[PDB]
Amino acid sequence: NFGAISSVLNDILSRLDPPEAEVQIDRLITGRLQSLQTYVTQQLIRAA
Amino acid sequence: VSMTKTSVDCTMYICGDSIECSNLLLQYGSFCTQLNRALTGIAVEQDK
Amino acid sequence: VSMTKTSVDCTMYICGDSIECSNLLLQYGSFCTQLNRALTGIAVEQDKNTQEVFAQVKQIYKTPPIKDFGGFNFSQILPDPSKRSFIEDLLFNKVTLAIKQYGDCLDLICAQKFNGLTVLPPLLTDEMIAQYTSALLAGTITSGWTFGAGAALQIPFAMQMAYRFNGIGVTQNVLYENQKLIANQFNSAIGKIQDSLSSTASALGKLQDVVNQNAQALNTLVKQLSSNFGAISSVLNDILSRLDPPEAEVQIDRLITGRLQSLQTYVTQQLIRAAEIRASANLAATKMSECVLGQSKRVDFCGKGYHLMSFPQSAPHGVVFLH
Amino acid sequence: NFGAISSVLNDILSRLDPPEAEVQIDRLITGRLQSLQTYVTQQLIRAAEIRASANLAATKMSECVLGQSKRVDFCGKGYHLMSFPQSAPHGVVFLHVTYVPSQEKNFTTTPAICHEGKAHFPREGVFVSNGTHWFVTQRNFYEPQIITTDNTFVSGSCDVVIGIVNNTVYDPLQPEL
Amino acid sequence: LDPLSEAKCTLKSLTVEKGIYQTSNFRVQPTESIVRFPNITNLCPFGEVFNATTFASVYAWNRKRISNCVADYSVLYNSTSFSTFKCYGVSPTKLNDLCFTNVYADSFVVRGDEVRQIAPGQTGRIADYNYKLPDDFTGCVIAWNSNNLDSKVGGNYNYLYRLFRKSNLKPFERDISTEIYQAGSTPCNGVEGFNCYFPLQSYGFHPTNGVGYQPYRVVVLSFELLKAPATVCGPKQSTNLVKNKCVNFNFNGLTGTGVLTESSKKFLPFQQFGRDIADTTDAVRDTLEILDITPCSFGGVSVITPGTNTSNQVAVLYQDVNCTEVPVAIHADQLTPTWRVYSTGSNVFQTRAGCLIGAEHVNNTYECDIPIGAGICASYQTNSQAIIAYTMSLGAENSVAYANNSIAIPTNFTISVTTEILP
Ligand SMILES: *[C@@H]1O[C@H](CO)[C@@H](O[C@@H]2O[C@H](CO)[C@@H](O)[C@H](O)[C@H]2NC(C)=O)[C@H](O)[C@H]1NC(C)=O
Ligand SMILES: *[C@@H]1O[C@H](CO)[C@@H](O[C@@H]2O[C@H](CO)[C@@H](O)[C@H](O)[C@H]2NC(C)=O)[C@H](O)[C@H]1NC(C)=O
Ligand SMILES: *[C@@H]1O[C@H](CO)[C@@H](O[C@@H]2O[C@H](CO)[C@@H](O)[C@H](O)[C@H]2NC(C)=O)[C@H](O)[C@H]1NC(C)=O
Ligand SMILES: *[C@@H]1O[C@H](CO)[C@@H](O)[C@H](O)[C@H]1NC(C)=O
Ligand SMILES: *[C@@H]1O[C@H](CO)[C@@H](O)[C@H](O)[C@H]1NC(C)=O
Ligand SMILES: *[C@@H]1O[C@H](CO)[C@@H](O)[C@H](O)[C@H]1NC(C)=O
Ligand SMILES: *[C@@H]1O[C@H](CO)[C@@H](O)[C@H](O)[C@H]1NC(C)=O
Ligand SMILES: *[C@@H]1O[C@H](CO)[C@@H](O)[C@H](O)[C@H]1NC(C)=O
Ligand SMILES: *[C@@H]1O[C@H](CO)[C@@H](O)[C@H](O)[C@H]1NC(C)=O
Ligand SMILES: *[C@@H]1O[C@H](CO)[C@@H](O)[C@H](O)[C@H]1NC(C)=O
Ligand SMILES: *[C@@H]1O[C@H](CO)[C@@H](O)[C@H](O)[C@H]1NC(C)=O
Ligand SMILES: *[C@@H]1O[C@H](CO)[C@@H](O)[C@H](O)[C@H]1NC(C)=O
């Protein structure tokens, strides 16, 4: 969830107005970006 | 000698098919290109 | 051999001249010191890398005036009265590098400098490195391999080459009966190398990639300041001018978190690249010890064939070996 | 604080209701997770370097202690003779024993000796002179010996060699008997 | 206070070891403040909006336009009292130091209960069929009770609203038609019979009603901030333009700290601000000229210290400043008296790295002790005790006696034992 009401984007979008939905979607975006960046860094460390 | 080469679609991993999420990801500021450059360098190194 | 040394001002990159942002950055908890320690370690390692490869012998031998070496001609690699050789000049011209003053800019470099991103100069200037390489060349062509052990002992050049032919498994008389032909072949090969370097085509892409990578990373840092990171705007003045401090704290905290993440990604990738540069420097120091100071019997270490000798030349951020 | 009202969880919990407390506790959780992840990444980056150094010390244990190495400046400066290991906290120490020549002397030399229209080259060593006599000596130590047909092999003719000189080869057998 | 104090604060310790150290700023603090606002002395009409005798119905709102005025609202304090006032996109304490763009004023009359529906993201008959507000709305909503002016003893039936509509209204859209709503099938054809309704209905305002029924006058103000050339401002007083110093500029409601210089950039008539690659403002129209803002601090500063255990004396290196340009660069004359000493001195040497102040230059070459860079090192030595700066020596010098018929043979040897440490 990363602090949002749910981990599914459809539930957040279906039940909330775009101004309210922005904060939850921003939380999800930050979390998933962090996951991708951790994956990439460990891939570089193994490639070495 | 080598390892597997991978590629990631940043918008499909984070947003899926949601237009609203894609607009928010544009506003947020995307560093997906940097991740892609790192992965492409890894793949070229593996072939070398 | 080495890469560029950089320093970052954490508060100037994140906050600028905003007192309110600085107070919030103090409250937030600052790990800027850890980033600075990592960058300082990188810079010290880069100077150490440069030192190891070139400062191996601390006796500055001088080029011999007589220059009678039995028909072998070294004018293209010995210095010329920044005291660099012909081939070193060609190499320094094939690589295109990337005091700036407040009056000078009042260009990407000053866009970096206004945001806390500075580049530090190396300890050894290029003249010093050229003096090191010329000392190595003089020592090798006068005393052969003896100088490496500890004390230089002069020996005529043809005698050295005879002992190298014995080294690879061919008897002396093969050199002494073919001396002029071998000298001509060596001179022609040096000529071909010079012609290849003077062509437009560049073989120094390995040394150009370092410069491109450094510039790309430092420019990505500056481009990444326009990201809103979920706030109303990416400019601190708009947030401060239009909102009360209690309301402004949440937006400024969002911006602080984003910019801290950007700095931490930059630092981590710099460490990952420094490891690889250190590997390459260690390789070039082993090759300086074993291909230049000695005759190597390892296969394909000092080129393809049976090794006879090697000569070093200095290049921007790196070294070149003629095997 | 990481943007929360305080850095102590008890103050946040004691003064606020669970719905209000969730946002502050989430801020703290995110910050502390980031701290742990930075620690782990830098530990991996250092482990790689320690592994490089360990591999180097295993190659040096195999080649400088178990064998005599001919690589230059691998087992110290000089000509390698042997090495001894000692253990140290978190590491290893090598004592390298090497041979360093000294007390040099200037001599005059030649590529070959011409006896009777035949060139003579040393089998191992170099021809040296003290200014009156010609001898053959080993390269790394001074040990002059009289030139005989067992020190020098014969090949070719005198004309080809640029710096050949004239001298005599002993040919032991015939004069002794 | 000092370069050494900067180093101590940066390192978080009371003792500083031997070494050259990078430092943060701390030295400069802004103290002045300029203001630039347009020449507008025509007060906005707060008498022909709030005091208007007749207000519109909610189904057909006025949508008035405002420009070329100063927006001083304290002139209302004596005359009117507002029961509702809420602002979106801006804080109510900054309203007196900002210049607004594209200002519009919408006006109508609702009942007391339906005031709460004038807000972004609401539902109800007024939000659905009469008046709608955008999700990203910047502006303010004001409402006040008017049971003295809009209520008649017999009843006031001149205010109307829409009750039936096929679909919801979009933001800032109006509908003044009066067709006949068709509840079911069997089209109406204007008969107005059964399942065919006239869509507009009338509020009935009597003086003796509940507070919820009582009439409430509503005004909505719409504007934009810091985007384009503005014309409505706030009660403030322009001040002289102190130039070439670290100040707070506050140009047309945009605040910050910086330095102002002339620019050759040309702006289209609808542009006033300009942003660069890092998205921060660099060019501002002022006279109608375009000026340029530059940060307060520029470049790096380093401190060379032989260690706090030995002495409290230090040297300072400026990396990007040719000497004689140092005082302007580091904004001297605003620094404390101790910090000025370093700006100008007898012990000034220009190195390739930058300018070094506080160290004496010798003509001898020793081994490096503290690397300054570009071939320069520094050391703490007696002469009394001082910090000297010299050029490093690569090593000893000699030559080899080379000759085509000469050799050197060793006669003796040495057994050497050396140590190598590995983690
Ligand atoms: C070693 O090589 C250099 C470079 O070719 C020789 O110097 C040049 O020789 C040519 C001969 O035609 C002259 O025309 C040039 O003027 C010389 N100088 C330069 C800078 O090119 C040099 O003579 C060679 N050494 C020998 C033959 O002993
Ligand atoms: C070079 O070495 C030869 C051989 O050692 C020297 O010749 C000897 O000189 C001594 C001098 O007392 C005589 O007693 C020997 O009989 C000589 N040997 C022969 C074979 O003749 C020679 O003198 C040395 N030359 C120099 C300049 O030192
Ligand atoms: C703008 O006008 C169009 C056309 O009058 C409206 O579309 C009608 O909407 C109703 C409500 O669902 C439908 O029953 C009609 O069939 C639509 N007409 C057509 C031609 O498709 C539209 O609703 C109006 N927009 C707004 C915001 O009211
Ligand atoms: C610094 O100033 C001197 C004096 O005018 C000038 O000669 C020099 O070119 C300037 N720049 C540098 C890098 O020394
Ligand atoms: C050899 O001779 C040169 C000069 O001819 C002299 O400088 C050198 O010291 C001599 N070698 C030794 C070992 O003395
Ligand atoms: C050595 O050089 C001299 C000239 O300096 C020359 O006369 C002599 O013949 C050369 N000797 C040999 C063996 O080449
Ligand atoms: C060696 O002897 C031959 C024949 O006597 C003579 O021609 C030649 O010049 C001699 N060599 C030298 C170096 O004098
Ligand atoms: C408002 O209108 C009334 C009636 O004309 C008038 O008496 C009053 O002075 C006006 N007030 C203002 C502030 O215009
Ligand atoms: C404030 O409003 C009242 C209401 O009539 C008026 O009598 C009074 O004079 C006003 N204040 C001033 C200073 O005019
Ligand atoms: C505004 O006031 C200033 C005051 O000096 C004057 O110079 C200027 O002409 C006036 N008008 C404009 C459009 O700036
Ligand atoms: C040091 O060398 C410079 C350059 O020749 C000279 O101007 C200066 O007077 C010298 N100073 C001393 C103390 O030798
Ligand atoms: C070699 O050196 C040792 C110690 O310095 C000395 O005792 C010995 O006599 C030397 N040998 C010669 C031949 O000089």
Coordinates of C-alpha atoms in Angstrom, one line a residue, chain A:
Chain A
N1 CA 0.0 0.0 0.0
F2 CA 2.9 2.4 0.8
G3 CA 0.5 4.4 3.1
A4 CA -2.4 4.7 0.6
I5 CA -5.9 3.4 1.2
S6 CA -5.3 0.5 -1.2
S7 CA -2.7 -1.0 -3.5
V8 CA -5.0 -1.1 -6.5
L9 CA -5.3 2.0 -8.7
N10 CA -8.8 1.2 -9.8
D11 CA -10.2 1.2 -6.2
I12 CA -8.5 4.6 -5.6
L13 CA -9.8 6.0 -8.9
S14 CA -13.3 4.6 -8.7
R15 CA -14.0 5.8 -5.2
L16 CA -12.3 9.2 -5.1
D17 CA -12.3 12.6 -6.8
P18 CA -9.2 13.5 -8.8
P19 CA -8.0 16.1 -6.2
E20 CA -8.4 13.6 -3.4
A21 CA -7.0 10.8 -5.6
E22 CA -3.8 12.7 -6.4
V23 CA -2.3 12.2 -2.9
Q24 CA -2.8 8.5 -2.8
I25 CA -1.6 8.0 -6.4
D26 CA 1.5 10.1 -5.5
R27 CA 2.2 7.8 -2.6
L28 CA 2.0 4.7 -4.9
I29 CA 4.2 6.4 -7.5
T30 CA 6.9 7.1 -5.0
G31 CA 6.9 3.6 -3.6
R32 CA 7.0 1.9 -7.0
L33 CA 9.8 4.2 -8.2
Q34 CA 11.8 3.3 -5.2
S35 CA 11.3 -0.4 -5.9
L36 CA 12.6 0.0 -9.5
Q37 CA 15.6 2.0 -8.3
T38 CA 16.6 -0.7 -5.8
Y39 CA 16.3 -3.4 -8.5
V40 CA 18.5 -1.4 -10.9
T41 CA 21.2 -0.7 -8.3
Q42 CA 21.6 -4.3 -7.2
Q43 CA 21.7 -5.3 -10.9
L44 CA 24.7 -3.0 -11.4
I45 CA 26.4 -4.4 -8.3
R46 CA 26.1 -7.9 -9.6
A47 CA 27.2 -7.0 -13.1
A48 CA 30.5 -5.8 -11.7

